[PDB]
């Protein structure tokens, strides 16, 4: 977050594996893997997309 030092806010970050994609609402995305990040004083937050696949590899 690169805003002023008086700025504030929280955010959500979701990764929904494919059974049905592009969640329209926020409550549709909150069921998948997610994290909650709030800004200020070391603002930068790291979301870790894990590895969840049947096979061992994937195609570029």
């Amino acid at each position: 977050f690169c805003g002023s030092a008086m700025a504030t806010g929280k955010f959500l970050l979701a990764y929904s594996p494919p059974g049905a994609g592009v969640p329209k609402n926020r409550r549709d995305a909150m069921l998948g893997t997610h994290v909650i990040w709030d800004v200020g004083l070391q603002s930068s937050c790291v979301l870790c997309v894990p590895w969840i696949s049947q096979t061992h590899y994937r195609y570029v």
């Binding site: 504030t8 909150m30 800004v39 200020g40």
Partner: protein, 254 residues
């Protein structure tokens, strides 16, 4: 231990990290645990479901206006439609869980305000008309916030709950609501509030659709304010995580 004011919570699949926060208030002094085999009466075997049920389901948001009174939620019912916690809630018949309530509200250094984040066990309510009893669509929202008012209740509609904020709707003194676990949100020096609640109830395992365990109440004791030239929209959100879930009595859905 360096820079106390930063926490981090990774429960299952989600992770919520705050940089400016107060301490964490942990229930009545206990951490939520499973049910021992010395106090159980169920004759079946339980079902510790997964990491897929102990996650961070975020509910709806609302606007902190300059005249708003207060909101509340019912805990075992608000998570009825969220993911695999709402499927193992209706397919089964029994269950016991604990939660990890969270709250976010962030403003600049030019705003002011306060809030009382508290959860009350076994929260009753009072109908508007004295004879009748409250409705259900006026007592619990479908994961959407219910809000107090300033005028008391009126005399309608013979089933509406009485939204008298200064009495809390339960029939007690609002200033005495600091007995149950809680935390304040002062925008001067605070940005969130965490609360860990165990399972408190008479019987070992109780239904989920017939009896609500807790109740989450939010009340701003000091209204928002700001001079001209600042963002006039301050929203609020809450993130809850079922902790140590269990179930029994498999049947058909409902």
């Amino acid at each position: 231990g360096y820079s106390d004011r930063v926490r981090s919570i990774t429960l299952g699949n989600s992770t919520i990290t705050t940089q400016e926060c107060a301490n964490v208030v942990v229930g009545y002094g206990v951490w939520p645990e499973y049910l021992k085999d010395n106090e159980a009466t169920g004759e079946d075997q339980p079902t510790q479901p997964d990491v897929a049920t102990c996650r961070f389901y975020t509910l709806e948001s609302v606007q902190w206006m300059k005249n708003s009174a207060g909101w509340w939620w019912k805990l075992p019912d608000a998570l009825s439609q969220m993911g695999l916690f709402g499927q193992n809630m209706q397919y089964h018949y029994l269950g016991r869980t604990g939660y990890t309530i969270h709250v976010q509200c962030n403003a600049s250094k030019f705003h002011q305000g306060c809030l009382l984040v508290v959860c009350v066990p076994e929260a009753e309510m009072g109908c508007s008309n004295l004879n009748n009893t409250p409705k259900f669509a006026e007592l619990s929202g479908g994961d959407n916030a219910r809000m107090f008012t300033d005028t008391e209740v009126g005399t309608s509609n013979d089933k509406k709950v009485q939204t008298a904020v200064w009495n809390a709707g339960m029939g007690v003194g609002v200033g005495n609501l600091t007995i149950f676990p809680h935390q304040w949100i002062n925008l001067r020096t605070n940005n969130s509030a965490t609360i860990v609640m165990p399972y408190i109830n008479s019987v070992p395992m109780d239904n989920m659709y017939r009896h609500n365990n807790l109740t989450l109440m939010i009340i701003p004791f000091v209204p928002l304010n700001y001079s001209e030239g600042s963002s006039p929209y301050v929203p609020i959100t809450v993130t809850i995580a079922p902790m140590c879930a269990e179930y029994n009595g498999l049947r058909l859905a409902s």
